[PDB]
Design a protein around this ligand. Structure first.
Ligand SMILES: [Cl-]
Ligand SMILES: [Cl-]
Length: 267
């Protein structure tokens, strides 16, 4: 009934903005979960970049790549919204810095460059998700094309549950051994695009790693986080939203508020 109560409130919340909210939350120190449309498909937007980064470290751990090798692109036409890759265009970035820019700033070139050069592309990226027990996630397009968020389109979508289970294996589990899991945890912890979403849902002295996504159509935006509360086991929160009209603005507060309700339902 604490989950029925939470469900009611998400439902109210989705009516208010005329859209669709997908939630899954896990409490790892109790097992308590909460879900709403947890297995319905949502567009990923940028949010798969949290997973690309982990793919990248997996490759370092297998010694297929070095975290410090330079990745040079001085002749490349840089994707729109490449804030980080643009200031390093003349000199290159370390593969680890490139990976992290794609995470923390949602840099589209860093993303494209990484999937074209190391990862096998969209389907390369799909393959790695398949390799951690995740059968929901799918990536079909490159960093810009994947943000169309067309209602009823299965391309570049996952379910909230799959995102959460995945982030949990990666951030908290054992796909990445010690040092490199710790790196990736640091990368999430240092994400810069998420202040008005899951971070805003929680006391500011709790520790939060997250990856946001913002399609910029269908008011489509999301966030997934690991959260370390004080004196308490980590939580996993996964929030997806779409809206009815193409020209609908995404809503940070809806995300922040659905995370507040989620976090309460698992406590
Ligand atoms: Cl559900
Ligand atoms: Cl891991």
């Amino acid at each position: 009934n604490k989950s029925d109560a939470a469900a009611k409130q998400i439902k109210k919340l989705e009516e208010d903005f005329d859209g669709r909210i997908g939630v899954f939350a896990i409490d790892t120190g109790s097992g308590n979960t909460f879900g709403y449309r947890s297995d319905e498909r949502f567009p990923l937007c940028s949010s798969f970049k949290g997973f690309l980064a982990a793919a990248v470290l997996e490759r370092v751990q297998q010694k297929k790549l070095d975290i410090n090798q330079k990745v040079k692109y001085e002749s490349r036409d840089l994707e729109y919204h490449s804030p980080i890759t643009t200031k390093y265009k003349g000199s290159g970035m370390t593969l680890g810095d490139m990976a992290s820019a794609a995470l923390q700033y949602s840099d589209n070139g860093a993303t494209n460059i990484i999937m074209e050069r190391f990862l096998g592309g969209p389907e390369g990226m799909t393959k790695f998700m398949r390799s951690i027990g995740d059968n929901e996630f799918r990536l079909d397009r490159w960093a810009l094309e994947l943000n169309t968020a067309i209602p009823g389109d299965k391309r570049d979508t996952s379910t909230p549950k799959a995102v959460a289970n995945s982030l949990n294996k990666l951030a908290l589990g054992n796909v990445l051994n010690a040092k490199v899991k710790a790196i990736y945890q640091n990368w999430l912890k240092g994400n810069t695009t998420g202040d008005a979403r899951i971070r805003a849902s929680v006391p500011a002295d709790w520790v939060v790693g997250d990856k946001t996504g913002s399609c910029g159509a269908y008011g489509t935006a999301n966030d997934y986080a690991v959260i370390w509360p004080k004196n308490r086991a980590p939580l996993i929160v996964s929030i997806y939203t779409t809206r009815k009209s193409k020209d609908d603005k995404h809503s940070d507060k809806t995300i922040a508020e659905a995370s507040r309700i989620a976090i309460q339902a698992i406590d």
